[PDB]
Amino acid sequence: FDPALLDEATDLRNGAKKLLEKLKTDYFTRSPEQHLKSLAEMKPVIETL
Amino acid sequence: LSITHSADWLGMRATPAGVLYFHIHDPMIQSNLPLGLDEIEQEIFKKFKMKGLLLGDQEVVRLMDTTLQEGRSNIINAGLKKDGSLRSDS
């Protein structure tokens, strides 16, 4: 094999991992219903602002 | 001053345990995960972990955090591993 290439492919795979984890923490740590509930909850404060 | 006068001031000679800072504030928790009330309270609590300097002893850390059995502490910036020794990041 090739230690450089060997250790490089793993970097790419871990890149895919980080991308996915970022996507997850961004949008999918709460249900869409929870997200919408939070959003709706903030409405009176915006109206005051 | 506290150590040098320790014997005279209150009775017996003492040994430097550590110097600790306590951050006085009302912290806001920034969580991406949904937290129950107990978990929130715990995070708020964690925000008050004291920075500073300690004396590396099982006895010293355990005295400062009697809850700590294994792992990291939420009061003092030190920890105990499974082996029991003070962990390096302390």
Curated annotation (Swiss-Prot), chain A:
The organism's place on the tree of life at top rank: Bacteria
Any coiled-coil regions, as ranges: none
Function statement: An essential component of the DNA double-stranded break repair machinery, the heterodimer acts both as a highly processive, ATP-dependent DNA helicase and an ATP-dependent, dual-direction single-stranded exonuclease. Recognizes the B.subtilis Chi site (5'-AGCGG-3') which transforms the enzyme from a helicase which degrades both DNA strands to one with only 5' -> 3' exonuclease activity. This generates a double-stranded DNA with a protruding 3'-terminated single-stranded tail suitable for the initiation of homologous recombination (Chi fragment).
Quaternary structure and interacting proteins, as annotated: Heterodimer of AddA and AddB.
Similarity annotation: Belongs to the helicase family. AddA subfamily.
Note: This enzyme is a functional homolog of the E.coli RecBCD enzyme; unlike the RecBCD enzyme it degrades both duplex strands symmetrically.
Name the UniProt record assigns to this protein: ATP-dependent helicase/nuclease subunit A
Lineage: Bacteria, Bacillati, Bacillota, Bacilli, Bacillales
Gene (name only): addA
Residues shown, of full length: 297 to 345 of 1232
Curated annotation (Swiss-Prot), chain B:
Similarity annotation: Belongs to the helicase family. AddB/RexB type 1 subfamily.
Protein name (record): ATP-dependent helicase/deoxyribonuclease subunit B
Full protein stretch here: 988 to 1077 of 1166
Quaternary data: Heterodimer of AddA and AddB.
Note: This enzyme is a functional homolog of the RecBCD enzyme; unlike the RecBCD enzyme it degrades both duplex strands symmetrically.
Function field: The heterodimer acts both as a highly processive, ATP-dependent DNA helicase and as an ATP-dependent single-stranded exonuclease, acting in both directions. Recognizes the B.subtilis Chi site (5'-AGCGG-3') which transforms the enzyme from a helicase which degrades both DNA strands to one with only 5' to 3' exonuclease activity. This generates a double-stranded DNA with a protruding 3'-terminated single-stranded tail suitable for the initiation of homologous recombination (Chi fragment).
Superkingdom to which the source organism belongs: Bacteria
Coiled coil feature spans: none
